[PDB]
Amino acid sequence: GSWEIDPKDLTFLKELGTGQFGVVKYGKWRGQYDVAIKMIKEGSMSEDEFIEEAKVMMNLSHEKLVQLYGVCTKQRPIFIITEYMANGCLLNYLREMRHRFQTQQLLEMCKDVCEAMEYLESKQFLHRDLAARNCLVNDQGVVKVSDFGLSRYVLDDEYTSSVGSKFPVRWSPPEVLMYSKFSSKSDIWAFGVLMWEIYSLGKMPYERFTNSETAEHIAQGLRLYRPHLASEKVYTIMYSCWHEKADERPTFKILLSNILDVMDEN
Ligand SMILES: Cc1cc(Nc2cc(-c3ccc(F)c(NC(=O)c4cc5c(s4)CCCC5)c3F)nn(C)c2=O)nn1C
Ligand SMILES: c1ccc(P(c2ccccc2)c2ccccc2)cc1
């Protein structure tokens, strides 16, 4: 039921790299509108499964979400057409601009993401792979959340298994590592790690630990340290995302309220 975009209306212009579904390109729709085009590599996605639920994903509409514009399913490979973000992913943006950010801008980035996630939460829609690498930055510095829900359609045991080399262990709460129990609260945990990515200016969480060591140690209570640029109030917010027990973690509505309160204080 999604918008079936006419592939004749797409002009491919540049390569944007490769991800879990293969090649992604920058292009235009009807000669005018910038778009990103995922060309879904054969065998990389549960395609019929994705097509069944693409309209739900398209119905997610929020300024801080990288919008799914539509799909092209009448040939092989299929295409997913989304909003284009000229400054690329947030992790590289943090690392490339590390020495220019003021602390107010770090908090604003967190707010952008929190707004998107509060919206997803209100629609009972799980991201499942929230991390700085899956946030993108537009030409005016606005951060938006991308690739929400797509984890569910990946065909790659290294990504889908919690002991696979590609699974997002460092963004996962204990109940995901142990029971594959995804919920709004596993997105909350990941958001806390994302806040840490932002305030550390793009450091790798649990650097020097392997994935299995990270899993072992977070299950025993290890938590990420306070980045130098995070105030105590900011750290309290990200740390609240990491309660061992999922039902003790806040909602995104509460987190957004906490972030706004810090802004008001400053
Ligand atoms: C200068 C510049 C601008 C720019 N802009 C964009 C790049 C990409 C993009 C490119 C390559 C990618 F590999 C991915 N991620 C994925 O494909 C997947 C992630 C996940 C998948 S698939 C399934 C499981 C969950 C996570 C991208 F999102 N997208 N969008 C919307 C852009 O606007 N890039 N650069 C270099
Ligand atoms: C009016 C015009 C464009 C848009 P979106 C769009 C979605 C799918 C296909 C084509 C366009 C848009 C896309 C790129 C840049 C700015 C807006 C929304 C209202």
How many CB atoms are located within 10 Å of the residue 16 CB? Answer: 18
Q: Pick the residue whose CA is nearest to atom 15 on ligand 2.
A: 33
Residue 263 dihedral angles phi and psi, to the nearest 5°: -60, -45
Which CATH number fits the domain that encloses residue 54?
3.30.200.20
Residue 94 to residue 246: CA distance in whole angstroms: 29
- Based on the domain organization, do 26 and 90 belong to the same domain? no
- Based on the domain organization, do 153 and 198 belong to the same domain? yes
- Based on the domain organization, do 101 and 232 belong to the same domain? yes
Residue 194 to residue 69: CA distance in whole angstroms: 25
CB-ligand 2 contact for 29 (6 Å cutoff) = yes
Residue whose CB lies within 8 A of the most ligand 1 atoms, among 13, 14, 15, 16, for a mutation test: 16
- Based on the domain organization, do 60 and 137 belong to the same domain? no
- Based on the domain organization, do 20 and 128 belong to the same domain? no
Q: Pick the residue whose CA is nearest to atom 17 on ligand 2.
A: 33
| Tally of structural domains, the chain | 2
Strand ranges in the chain using DSSP code E only, listed in sequence order = 10-19, 22-29, 33-39, 68-72, 79-83, 135-137, 143-145
Per the structure, the complete domain to which residue 95 belongs is given by: 85-266
Q: Which two tokens stand for residue 51?
A: 């097509």
Residue 219 to residue 213: CA distance in whole angstroms: 10
Domain boundary among 84, 102, 129: 84
Ligand (nearest to CA of 90): 1
Q: Pick the residue whose CA is nearest to atom 12 on ligand 2.
A: 33
Resolution reading in Å: 1.5
- Based on the domain organization, do 150 and 62 belong to the same domain? no
User: CA distances (Å), 3 to each of 59, 73, 134, 163, 221, in order?
Assistant: 10, 10, 23, 36, 46
Contacts for 264 with CB less than 8 Å, ≥ 6 apart: none
- Based on the domain organization, do 93 and 77 belong to the same domain? no
- Based on the domain organization, do 75 and 187 belong to the same domain? no
Catalytic residue status for 129:
yes
> What number of helices (H) and strands (E) belong to the chain?
9, 7
* Rg of the chain, C-alpha, whole Å: 18
Contacts for 91 with CB less than 8 Å, ≥ 6 apart: 131, 132, 133, 135, 197, 202
CB-ligand 1 contact for 45 (6 Å cutoff) = no
Domain boundary among 64, 84, 104: 84
Contact (CB, 8 A) for 29 and 35? yes
Its sign, for the CA torsion 154, 160, 164, 170, is positive
Q: Which two tokens stand for residue 78?
A: 């299929």
